[PDB]
Amino acid sequence: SQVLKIRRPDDWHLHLRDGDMLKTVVPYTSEIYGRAIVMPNLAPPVTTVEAAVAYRQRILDAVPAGHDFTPLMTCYLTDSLDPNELERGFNEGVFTAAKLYPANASTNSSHGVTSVDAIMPVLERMEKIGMPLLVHGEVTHADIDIFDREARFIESVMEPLRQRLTALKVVFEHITTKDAADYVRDGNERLAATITPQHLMFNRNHMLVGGVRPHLYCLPILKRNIHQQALRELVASGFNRVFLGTDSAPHARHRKESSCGCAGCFNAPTALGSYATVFEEMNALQHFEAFCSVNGPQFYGLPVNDTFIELVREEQQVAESIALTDDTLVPFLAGETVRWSVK
Amino acid sequence: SQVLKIRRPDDWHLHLRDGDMLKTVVPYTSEIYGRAIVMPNLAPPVTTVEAAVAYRQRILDAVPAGHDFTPLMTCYLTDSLDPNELERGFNEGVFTAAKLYPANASTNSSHGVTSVDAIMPVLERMEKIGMPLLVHGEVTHADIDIFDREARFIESVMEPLRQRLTALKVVFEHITTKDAADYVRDGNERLAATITPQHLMFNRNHMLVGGVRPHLYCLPILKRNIHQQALRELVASGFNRVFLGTDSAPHARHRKESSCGCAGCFNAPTALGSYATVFEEMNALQHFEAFCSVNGPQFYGLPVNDTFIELVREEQQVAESIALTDDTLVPFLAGETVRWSVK
Numbered sequence: 001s002q003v004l005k006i007r008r009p010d011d012w013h014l015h016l017r018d019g020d021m022l023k024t025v026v027p028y029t030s031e032i033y034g035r036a037i038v039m040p041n042l043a044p045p046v047t048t049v050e051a052a053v054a055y056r057q058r059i060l061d062a063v064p065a066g067h068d069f070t071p072l073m074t075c076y077l078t079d080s081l082d083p084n085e086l087e088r089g090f091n092e093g094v095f096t097a098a099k100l101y102p103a104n105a106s107t108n109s110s111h112g113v114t115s116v117d118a119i120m121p122v123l124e125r126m127e128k129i130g131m132p133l134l135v136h137g138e139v140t141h142a143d144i145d146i147f148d149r150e151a152r153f154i155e156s157v158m159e160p161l162r163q164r165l166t167a168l169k170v171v172f173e174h175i176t177t178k179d180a181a182d183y184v185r186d187g188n189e190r191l192a193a194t195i196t197p198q199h200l201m202f203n204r205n206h207m208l209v210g211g212v213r214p215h216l217y218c219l220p221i222l223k224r225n226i227h228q229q230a231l232r233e234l235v236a237s238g239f240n241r242v243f244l245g246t247d248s249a250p251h252a253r254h255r256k257e258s259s260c261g262c263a264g265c266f267n268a269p270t271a272l273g274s275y276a277t278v279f280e281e282m283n284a285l286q287h288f289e290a291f292c293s294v295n296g297p298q299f300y301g302l303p304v305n306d307t308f309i310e311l312v313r314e315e316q317q318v319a320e321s322i323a324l325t326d327d328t329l330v331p332f333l334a335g336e337t338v339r340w341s342v343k
Numbered sequence: 344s345q346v347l348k349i350r351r352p353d354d355w356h357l358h359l360r361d362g363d364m365l366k367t368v369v370p371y372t373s374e375i376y377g378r379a380i381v382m383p384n385l386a387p388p389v390t391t392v393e394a395a396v397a398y399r400q401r402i403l404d405a406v407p408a409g410h411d412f413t414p415l416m417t418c419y420l421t422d423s424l425d426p427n428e429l430e431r432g433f434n435e436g437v438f439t440a441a442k443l444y445p446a447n448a449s450t451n452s453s454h455g456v457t458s459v460d461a462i463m464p465v466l467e468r469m470e471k472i473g474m475p476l477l478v479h480g481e482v483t484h485a486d487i488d489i490f491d492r493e494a495r496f497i498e499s500v501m502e503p504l505r506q507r508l509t510a511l512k513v514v515f516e517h518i519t520t521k522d523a524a525d526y527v528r529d530g531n532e533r534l535a536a537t538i539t540p541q542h543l544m545f546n547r548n549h550m551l552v553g554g555v556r557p558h559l560y561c562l563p564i565l566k567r568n569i570h571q572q573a574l575r576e577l578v579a580s581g582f583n584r585v586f587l588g589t590d591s592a593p594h595a596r597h598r599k600e601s602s603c604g605c606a607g608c609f610n611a612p613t614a615l616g617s618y619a620t621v622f623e624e625m626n627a628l629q630h631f632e633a634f635c636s637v638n639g640p641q642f643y644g645l646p647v648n649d650t651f652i653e654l655v656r657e658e659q660q661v662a663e664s665i666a667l668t669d670d671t672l673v674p675f676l677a678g679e680t681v682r683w684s685v686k
């Protein structure tokens with residue numbers, strides 16, 4: 001059966017949580033990936049260098065002996081955030097990028113953004129020092145339909161921003177529409193994107209047809225088929241400014257399977273093999289390593305990993321659940337068979 | 344505060360299940376409604392007069408003393424179903440209508456329909472004897488997107504059927520699109536429809552924005568806002584061939600809140616007040632009684648109820664759950680406040 005040797009990949013979009021879950025989930029990433037963009041959306045969020053330095057250490061405490069893993073920390077953008085604070089953390093090599101979560105006028109200034117025009121100063125600073133901006137591209141006005149929120153973000157926020165700040169390096173994170181696929185495809189060298197395994201593998205029918213399936217519920221939300229196909233074609237194309245970001249967003253089973261299930265997929269354990277399946281299905285394994293291992297590093301301006309991992313096309317059963325201190329974690333594709341696996 | 348006196352209403356679309364749940368759920372309907380269309384989608388489904396007569400009796404056993412309730416039984420249409428069997432049950436007054444669930448070529452002939460062209464004989468018989476056809480209007484081919492399935496059904500099944508059988512009386516059950524709203528609005532006297540409280544009250548954003556909410560997950564699936572508004576306008580219009588059908592589809596909480604939650608809303612307990620809210624919100628309480636109490640009877644060709652119930656605009660808390668032999672039932676709008684209630 002078939003062996004596939006690639007560079008040690010990176011995860012350029014990851015939530016590792018905190019506390020007893022941070023311990024549970026880090027091994028699934030640190031065992032396979034060399035570096036990962038850790039998100040700042042904790043409670044409270046990571047908006048200072050002290051919080052970031054501290055959190056980074058907590059991650060390192062969770063890393064198994066022998067694992068060579070490096071968490072690349074990011075900063076949660078808020079209205080109250082001081083440009084000097086972000087500038088300092090970037091200079092000291094604490095922050096790699098800053099993350100912009102959807103704007104909302106009601107949002108408390110300590111916990112997020114009211115509008116993009118409000119945080120212009122820090123965005124202008126990010127431009128000067130050449131710091132990458134990571135973007136959750138969704139407009140969250142109540143009137144806007146959930147399946148339109150990514151598309152709307154491009155018109156009314158993204159394009160105007162990138163025109164205003166021509167020199168800003170922007171990662172359009174976890175794109176899920178043909179709209180975004182095109183936007184990035186036709187954009188310049190300062191615009192890139194990450195794509196999750198679930199957004200390539202499935203569409204909204206998988207989440208809803210024959211029952212509601214909360215473990216495929218995340219954001220941005222699985223769109224219809226024509227959008228799915230767009231993403232698979234973009235990565236298969238060989239376009240060199242898409243790269244691996246899992247958006248591994250683990251929630252306890254009781255939280256996912258409730259009257260109001262949380263958004264997020266714990267895919268870290270199965271993502272790499274899952275990607276490797278989609279690239280094989282698209283007859284595009286020649287562009288696989290690049291997507292994993294090169295394109296992200298090349299965009300962020302970091303050295304590429306110097307070690308290699310192997311994948312094997314031996315079919316493997318995914319775990320039904322992972323034990324947590326309380327409750328469990330249902331992984332992405334739990335109990336399912338996968339075509340590819342790490343040796 | 345405000346009192347609203349109307350005729351004793353009917354529910355022209357209802358699932359009452361069987362066994363220990365049938366006992367749990369009948370009181371919620373029998374206490375308020377005079378008559379109700381009970382669906383045949385049991386396991387095994389109701390496809391004989393013996394099964395129907397028997398099931399009818401089981402329902403009557405579940406009805407509290409003093410409640411004047413009459414279950415109007417229906418037949419599940421299958422390929423193997425004998426026209427003479429349906430003709431006999433209709434003549435004997437066992438069957439009121441026959442229900443057509445979505446076609447599917449793989450479906451076992453004892454449990455459903457492969458295609459509409461296959462069951463033409465029984466449909467032609469239904470036409471002759473003037474028996475109403477009830478329709479779940481969705482095409483269930485895998486390729487078709489879930490939010491397009493009702494719209495597709497109109498083009499490729501409904502219109503061709505109604506042209507083929509010009510004299511057939513068809514209830515387009517629980518319509519959920521502007522497409523269906525228009526179709527029925529502009530149709531003839533032999534075409535009517537039911538509409539649920541959830542399809543008037545909410546749209547898909549309510550189910551998905553800020554978490555996945557399985558207790559609003561049913562079929563047909565909540566569409567986007569422009570479809571919601573269409574339904575509210577149609578009922579508010581005063582159009583006299585829409586009428587109350589709850590599609591009360593109760594599932595145990597552990598079944599709704601799982602890795603694969605079932606489709607259905609247990610709305611029977613809160614539906615009437617919920618409808619009364621939407622008609623008030625649409626400034627259309629003059630057409631409320633009709634929708635509840637007259638239009639259905641008028642379409643089915645039955646006498647209208649001769650007793651009256653009162654509603655009051657005293658705000659009332661909905662139960663968080665109802666106790667089942669095992670597990671519980673989370674009702675529609677559980678723990679919520681409602682504006683209208685029965686006295």
Ligand SMILES: O=C(O)c1[nH]c(=O)[nH]c(=O)c1F
Pocket residue numbers: 015041136217218219220249263264265
């Ligand atoms: O971390 C999460 O809970 C999470 N899950 C998501 O599916 N999307 C997000 O944008 C996010 F922040």
Ligand SMILES: O=C(O)c1[nH]c(=O)[nH]c(=O)c1F
Pocket residue numbers: 358384479560561562563592606607608
């Ligand atoms: O009875 C059910 O489970 C059910 N629930 C639904 O939401 N739609 C149906 O068509 C149906 F048969």
Ligand SMILES: [Zn+2]
Pocket residue numbers: 136173174219220247
């Ligand atoms: Zn995100």
Ligand SMILES: [Zn+2]
Pocket residue numbers: 013014015039247249
């Ligand atoms: Zn994320």
Ligand SMILES: [Zn+2]
Pocket residue numbers: 479516517562563590
């Ligand atoms: Zn139905």
Ligand SMILES: [Zn+2]
Pocket residue numbers: 356357358382590592
């Ligand atoms: Zn039904």
